[PDB]
Amino acid sequence: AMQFDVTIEIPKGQRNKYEVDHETGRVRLDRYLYTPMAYPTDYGFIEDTLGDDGDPLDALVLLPQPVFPGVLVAARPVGMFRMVDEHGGDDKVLCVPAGDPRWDHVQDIGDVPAFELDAIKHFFVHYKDLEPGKFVKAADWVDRAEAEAEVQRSVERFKA
Amino acid sequence: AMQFDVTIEIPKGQRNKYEVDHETGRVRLDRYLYTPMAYPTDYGFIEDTLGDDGDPLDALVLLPQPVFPGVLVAARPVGMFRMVDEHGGDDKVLCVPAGDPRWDHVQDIGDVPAFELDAIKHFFVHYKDLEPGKFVKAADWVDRAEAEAEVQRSVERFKA
Amino acid sequence: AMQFDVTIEIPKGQRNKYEVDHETGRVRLDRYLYTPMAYPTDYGFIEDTLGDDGDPLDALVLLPQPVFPGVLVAARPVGMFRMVDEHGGDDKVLCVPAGDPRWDHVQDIGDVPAFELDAIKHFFVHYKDLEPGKFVKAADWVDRAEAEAEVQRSVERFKA
Amino acid sequence: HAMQFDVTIEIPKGQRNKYEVDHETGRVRLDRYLYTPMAYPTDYGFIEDTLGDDGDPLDALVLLPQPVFPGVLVAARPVGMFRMVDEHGGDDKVLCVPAGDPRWDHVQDIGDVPAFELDAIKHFFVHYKDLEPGKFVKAADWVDRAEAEAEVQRSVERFKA
Amino acid sequence: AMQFDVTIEIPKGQRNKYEVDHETGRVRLDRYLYTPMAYPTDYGFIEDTLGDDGDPLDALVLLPQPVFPGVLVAARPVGMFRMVDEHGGDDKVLCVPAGDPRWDHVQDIGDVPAFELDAIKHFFVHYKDLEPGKFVKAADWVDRAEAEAEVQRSVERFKA
Amino acid sequence: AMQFDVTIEIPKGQRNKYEVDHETGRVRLDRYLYTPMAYPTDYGFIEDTLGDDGDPLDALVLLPQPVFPGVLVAARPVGMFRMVDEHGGDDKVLCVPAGDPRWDHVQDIGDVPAFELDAIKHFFVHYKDLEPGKFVKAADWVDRAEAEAEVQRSVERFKA
Ligand SMILES: [Mn+2]
Ligand SMILES: [Mn+2]
Ligand SMILES: [Mn+2]
Ligand SMILES: [Mn+2]
Ligand SMILES: [Mn+2]
Ligand SMILES: [Mn+2]
Ligand SMILES: [Mn+2]
Ligand SMILES: [Mn+2]
Ligand SMILES: [Mn+2]
Ligand SMILES: [Mn+2]
Ligand SMILES: [Mn+2]
Ligand SMILES: [Mn+2]
Ligand SMILES: [Mn+2]
Numbered sequence: 001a002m003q004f005d006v007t008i009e010i011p012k013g014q015r016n017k018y019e020v021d022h023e024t025g026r027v028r029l030d031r032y033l034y035t036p037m038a039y040p041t042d043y044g045f046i047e048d049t050l051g052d053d054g055d056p057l058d059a060l061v062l063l064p065q066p067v068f069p070g071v072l073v074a075a076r077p078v079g080m081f082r083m084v085d086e087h088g089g090d091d092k093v094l095c096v097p098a099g100d101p102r103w104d105h106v107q108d109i110g111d112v113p114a115f116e117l118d119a120i121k122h123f124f125v126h127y128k129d130l131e132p133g134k135f136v137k138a139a140d141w142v143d144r145a146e147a148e149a150e151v152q153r154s155v156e157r158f159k160a
Numbered sequence: 161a162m163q164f165d166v167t168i169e170i171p172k173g174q175r176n177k178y179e180v181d182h183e184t185g186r187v188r189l190d191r192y193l194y195t196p197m198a199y200p201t202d203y204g205f206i207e208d209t210l211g212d213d214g215d216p217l218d219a220l221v222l223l224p225q226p227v228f229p230g231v232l233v234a235a236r237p238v239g240m241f242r243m244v245d246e247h248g249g250d251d252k253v254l255c256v257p258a259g260d261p262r263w264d265h266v267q268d269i270g271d272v273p274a275f276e277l278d279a280i281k282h283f284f285v286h287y288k289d290l291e292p293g294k295f296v297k298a299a300d301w302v303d304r305a306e307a308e309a310e311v312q313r314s315v316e317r318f319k320a
Numbered sequence: 321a322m323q324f325d326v327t328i329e330i331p332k333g334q335r336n337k338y339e340v341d342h343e344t345g346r347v348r349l350d351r352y353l354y355t356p357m358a359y360p361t362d363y364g365f366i367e368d369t370l371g372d373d374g375d376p377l378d379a380l381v382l383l384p385q386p387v388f389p390g391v392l393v394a395a396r397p398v399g400m401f402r403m404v405d406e407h408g409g410d411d412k413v414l415c416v417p418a419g420d421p422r423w424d425h426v427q428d429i430g431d432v433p434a435f436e437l438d439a440i441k442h443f444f445v446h447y448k449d450l451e452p453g454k455f456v457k458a459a460d461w462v463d464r465a466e467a468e469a470e471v472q473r474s475v476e477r478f479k480a
Numbered sequence: 481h482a483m484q485f486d487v488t489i490e491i492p493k494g495q496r497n498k499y500e501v502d503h504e505t506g507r508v509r510l511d512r513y514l515y516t517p518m519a520y521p522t523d524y525g526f527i528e529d530t531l532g533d534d535g536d537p538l539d540a541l542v543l544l545p546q547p548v549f550p551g552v553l554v555a556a557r558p559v560g561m562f563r564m565v566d567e568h569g570g571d572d573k574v575l576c577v578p579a580g581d582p583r584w585d586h587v588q589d590i591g592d593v594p595a596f597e598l599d600a601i602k603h604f605f606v607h608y609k610d611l612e613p614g615k616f617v618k619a620a621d622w623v624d625r626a627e628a629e630a631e632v633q634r635s636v637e638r639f640k641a
Numbered sequence: 642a643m644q645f646d647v648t649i650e651i652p653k654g655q656r657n658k659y660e661v662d663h664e665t666g667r668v669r670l671d672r673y674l675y676t677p678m679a680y681p682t683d684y685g686f687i688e689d690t691l692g693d694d695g696d697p698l699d700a701l702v703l704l705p706q707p708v709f710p711g712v713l714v715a716a717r718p719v720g721m722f723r724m725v726d727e728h729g730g731d732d733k734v735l736c737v738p739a740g741d742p743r744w745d746h747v748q749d750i751g752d753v754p755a756f757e758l759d760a761i762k763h764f765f766v767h768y769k770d771l772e773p774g775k776f777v778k779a780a781d782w783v784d785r786a787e788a789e790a791e792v793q794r795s796v797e798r799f800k801a
Numbered sequence: 802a803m804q805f806d807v808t809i810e811i812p813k814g815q816r817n818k819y820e821v822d823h824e825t826g827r828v829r830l831d832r833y834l835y836t837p838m839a840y841p842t843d844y845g846f847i848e849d850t851l852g853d854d855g856d857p858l859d860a861l862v863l864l865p866q867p868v869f870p871g872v873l874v875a876a877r878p879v880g881m882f883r884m885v886d887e888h889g890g891d892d893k894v895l896c897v898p899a900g901d902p903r904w905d906h907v908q909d910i911g912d913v914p915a916f917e918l919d920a921i922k923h924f925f926v927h928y929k930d931l932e933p934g935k936f937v938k939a940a941d942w943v944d945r946a947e948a949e950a951e952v953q954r955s956v957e958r959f960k961a
Binding site: 015016018021026027028029031032068069 | 704706708711712741743
C-alpha cells in the first residue's frame with residue numbers, strides 16, 4: 001500500500017486553528033474559530049508535496065488518540081475530500097496510520113463509516129460561517145484511487 | 161434583582177450530551193453529538209421550574225472556567241435564546257453567576273458580545289443537523305425583561 | 321433486543337480505580353493502581369443486577385468519548401469477558417450504546433476487533449500484578465448469546 | 481491498627497473553581513471562581529460524619545498521587561493539621577493520607593511530609609483570598625498528628641446528637 | 642498601528658515554567674513553580690527584539706483559549722506591566738490578538754477589566770515568595786503610549 | 802555532582818509513543834501502544850550521548866508535573882534501569898531535576914520509593930506484550946555509580 005509522512009497541525013477536538021509556516025517550520029496561531037466547532041480529525045499536510053494552490057496537500061488522519069502540532073505521522077490514503085471554498089477549490093486527503101495492522105480493515109472510503117464522513121463534511125461546510133467573505137459551498141467524497149492519483153501528481157510537482 | 165440555582169449538566173467545550181434524569185436525579189448520558197461541535201457555554205436547567213413540555217426551563221451560564229455535570233450555580237438572567245425545533249419551542253435563559261462583581265458589567269443582552277451570541281445561536285441551530293427527524297427553523301435573541309418573564313412564568317408552573 | 325442501564329464507575333484512561341458504594345450510591349476511591357496502566361474502556365456495573373457474590377454484574381461500555389464517574393448509559397450487550405481473580409471467578413459484560421445507529425454494525429463479539437479485546441484482556445490480567453495476594457490466572461472471551469444469559473441470570477436472582 | 485475515617489473530596493488538586501458540597505442536600509455547588517491566580521495545592525474536602533465548632537464537618541486535606549473528582553469518598557488517616565486564622569476566625573484543616581495504603585506508610589507524622597509541600601499548602605491558604613472583596617488571612621501554621629487526632633476526636637463525639 | 646509576533650512559551654493555567662533558549666530556539670523546562678500558582682495569561686516574548694537584559698521583551702497575550710509552547714501569535718500592545726525583581730527591573734507588554742475583530746474593543750489598559758489586571762499583578766508579586774533570594778518590590782500598570790515606547794526602544798536595540 | 806540535558810519524548814501518562822528523529826530533530830509518532838498502558842514517568846533521551854545501538858542514552862525523569870515532547874530538562878542521575886528487549890541491552894538512566902532543592906533527598910536508587918521503581922519496571926516489561934516478535938526478558942535496578950559510569954562511557958562514544 002502507498003505511504004507518506006503527514007505533519008499534523010491541528011489536533012482532533014481543537015478550536016484553535018494552528019498553521020505551520022512552510023519556511024521557518026514554526027507553529028503559528030492563525031485564529032480562534034468564530035463558530036462553536038472543533039476539528040473532527042487530526043488535520044495537517046503531507047510533507048514534501050506541492051499542489052496547484054502553491055501550498056502542500058492538506059491531510060486528515062484518523063487516529064485512536066490525537067497528537068500535538070508539528071508532529072510527524074506515517075500515513076496511507078483511504079480517500080480524498082473535494083470541496084470549493086472562497087479560494088476556489090482545495091483538496092484534503094483522508095489518511096490512516098501506515099504500517100498499523102489495526103487499520104487493515106479500512107482500505108477505502110467505503111470502509112470509513114458514513115457517520116464520520118458526514119461529520120468531517122459537516123465541519124468544513126460550517127466552520128467559517130461566521131467569518132465575513134469566507135465560505136464552503138461544494139463538498140463530496142472520492143475514493144482511494146483518485147486520492148493516490150492526486151498525491152502521486154503533487155509529489156512530482158514538489159520535485160520541480 | 162432576580163436570582164436562582166442553575167443545575168449545569170453539560171460543561172463548555174463538550175461533545176458528550178449529558179442529561180439529568182429529573183425523576184431519579186442521576187446524571188445520564190443522552191448521546192455523543194452527531195455533528196463535530198462543542199457546547200459554547202455551560203448548559204443546563206433552572207431548579208424548581210417547569211414548562212409546557214413538563215421539563216424544567218433550560219439555562220446557559222457564562223463562566224470563566226467550566227464545571228462538572230450536576231453542579232449547582234447561583235445565577236441571574238441577562239437575556240434568553242428563543243429557538244423553535246422538532247418538539248415545538250425550547251427557550252434557553254442566558255445567565256451570569258450571581259453575587260459576582262466581575263460580571264456586574266453584564267446586565268442586559270446588549271452587554272454580551274455579539275460574537276459570543278452568534279456562536280451560541282450557531283450551535284443550537286446546527287448541532288442536530290445530521291440526526292434524522294431533528295431540526296431547528298427559528299432562532300432569536302431576546303432581552304432580559306422577556307427572560308425574567310419566562311422564568312417567573314415557568315417558576316409558577318412548578319408551584320402548581 | 322435486550323437493553324439496560326450501566327453506571328460507569330471508572331472513565332476510560334484512568335489509573336484511579338473508583339467504585340460505587342452500593343448501600344449509599346456514593347463514588348468511593350478504592351485505590352490508585354499499583355501498575356503503570358489505565359482502564360482500556362469505560363468501566364462499571366449493570367444497574368438492577370445481583371451476582372453470585374452480592375455485587376451487581378460488572379460491565380464494559382465501548383464509547384467514542386469517555387464519561388464521568390456515576391454517569392448512566394443505555395447499553396446493549398455484544399459479548400462478555402470472563403476471568404478468574406483471587407476471589408474466584410468474575411464476569412465482565414461488553415456493551416455498546418443502545419439506540420445509537422453508529423453501533424449497529426457491532427452485533428456480536430466477532431464484530432469488535434481482536435486488538436481491542438486483547439487490550440482489554442491484557443489490562444485485567446496484569447493490573448493486579450504488584451498487589452500482594454491478588455492475581456489473575458484464567459481469562460477468555462464468550463459471545464453475545466451467552467452474555468445475554470448471564471445478565472438475565474443476574475437479573476432474576478436480583479429480583480428475589 | 482490506627483485511626484481512620486471517610487473524607488469526601490470537594491475540590492480536586494490543581495483547581496481554581498471553589499466547589500462546596502451542601503451537607504444538608506448532598507449536592508455539589510460552585511461557591512466561586514477564585515479571585516487570585518492560584519490552584520488548590522491538594523485535594524480539598526471534609527471528614528464525613530464529624531461536626532466542627534462552626535456547625536460544619538471538619539475540613540480535610542488529602543495528599544494523593546493523582547487527584548479525584550468532586551464528591552468522591554476516600555478512606556484516610558490523619559498525619560498533621562493546618563490551623564489558620566481568616567475573616568471567620570480560626571479554621572482547622574486536617575492533613576491526611578490514604579488509609580490502608582502501604583505507599584503512604586512512610587508518612588506517619590507531619591515531620592515526614594516534606595517542607596516545600598507544607599509551605600506550598602500554607603502559602604495557598606494565606607494568599608488565595610487576597611483579591612477577594614471582604615475576606616482576608618491573618619495567621620497560619622502547622623501542628624502534629626497528636627493534636628490532629630484530638631480535634632477529630634472532639635469533632636466525632638460532638639457529631640452524636 | 643504597531644504590531645508584532647509573540648512567542649508564547651508558557652500557556653495559561655500552567656505551573657510548569659518553560660523558557661525558550663534564545664540561541665538554540667528550543668523549549669526548556671526552567672522550573673516547576675515553588676508556589677501553588679498558575680500563569681494567569683499566556684506568557685511569552687516578542688520576536689526580533691532586545692532589552693537591556695540581553696533578552697527580548699516578555700509578552701502577556703490575552704487569548705480566548707491557550708496555545709502550546711513555541712507557538713507564534715501576531716499581537717499588538719494595549720499596555721505594559723512594569724515590575725522590579727531581585728535581578729532588577731522587568732517589563733511585560735500586555736497584548737491582544739492583532740487583526741482580530743473580537744479584541745478591537747480592547748484599545749488601552751483602561752479597557753482591560755481591573756479584576757484581570759489585579760490578578761495578573763498578583764501572580765508576579767507572589768509566585769516567587771517561597772523561592773529564596775528572589776522577590777519583587779514594585780508592581781504597576783502603564784498605558785499603551787508608554788508601553789509602545791519600550792517596545793520600539795528594544796526593536797531598535799535589536800539591530801547590531 | 803554529574804548533570805546533563807535530557808530531551809523528553811513522551812510525557813508521563815501518555816499512550817502515544819513519540820520519538821525524536823535524531824537526524825532531523827522533529828517529533829514523530831512511532832505508534833499508539835497496543836497494550837492499555839501509560840508511561841509512568843517522563844521518558845526521553847540524554848542530549849549529546851551515543852550508545853552501542855546507534856541512538857543516545859534513553860532517560861527517565863521524575864517530575865512533579867509532566868512536560869511536552871521536545872522540552873529540555875537540566876537533570877542529574879540517581880540510578881539506572883537495566884533491560885534487555887528483542888535488540889539486546891537497552892538501559893534507561895533514572896534522573897531528577899538538577900539544582901532543584903526539592904529533589905536533594907534523592908541521591909541514589911535506594912532513595913527513590915520502591916513502589917515507583919516497580920511500576921517503571923512493570924511498564925517496560927509488558928508494554929510490547931501484544932506486539933509480535935517483541936519482548937523484554939531482563940530487568941534490574943543499579944547504583945547511581947553504575948548509572949553515572951554508563952553515561953560517561955557514552956559521552957566518550959559521542960566525540961567522533
Ligand atoms: Mn493544511
Ligand atoms: Mn488547501
Ligand atoms: Mn461566511
Ligand atoms: Mn426545555
Ligand atoms: Mn464494577
Ligand atoms: Mn470548616
Ligand atoms: Mn482581601
Ligand atoms: Mn525579560
Ligand atoms: Mn524571563
Ligand atoms: Mn523569596
Ligand atoms: Mn535507545
Ligand atoms: Mn527508544
Ligand atoms: Mn509479543
